[PDB]
């Protein structure tokens, strides 16, 4: 009879599968892919990442709720590098 109780999910952590950059919005005066305090389901965008001289969107790989954004909009990322933390 706790947070988990059953099913169990355990927060996740988006690890830039490709070195480059990371973004949270398609623009400066644009909406945010993930609004802190929202839920995401497998198939919902979590953020973006710059690589291969082109934008690379990141779709949630496991439905969950925001947790904390380590990387910032535009901040560079590396391999096995943590980006966003989901719950």
- The contacts of residue 24 (CB under 8 Å, 6+ apart) are 32, 33, 34, 47, 48, 69, 72, 73
| Cα 83 to Cα 76: distance, rounded to the nearest angstrom | 9
Collapsed DSSP state (helix, strand, coil) of residue 20:
strand
Ordered by where they begin, the domains of the chain are 1-87 (2.40.50.100)
The residue with tokens 């001289």 is: 53
Question: How many Cα atoms within 13 Å fall on the side-chain side of residue 12?
Answer: 15
The long-range contacts involving 74-78, CB below 8 angstroms and separated by at least 24 positions, are: 74/21, 74/22, 74/23, 75/21, 75/22, 76/20, 76/21, 76/22, 77/16, 77/19, 77/20, 77/21, 77/22, 77/49, 78/16, 78/19
Method: NMR
């Amino acid at each position: 009879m706790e947070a988990p109780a059953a099913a169990e999910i355990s927060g996740h952590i988006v690890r830039s599968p490709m070195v480059g950059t990371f973004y949270r919005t398609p623009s400066p005066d644009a909406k945010a892919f993930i609004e802190v305090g929202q839920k995401v389901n497998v198939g919902d965008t979590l953020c973006i990442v710059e690589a291969m001289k082109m934008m690379n969107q990141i779709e949630a790989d496991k439905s969950g709720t925001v947790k904390a954004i380590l990387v910032e909009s535009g901040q560079p990322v590396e391999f096995d590098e943590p980006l966003v933390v989901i719950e």
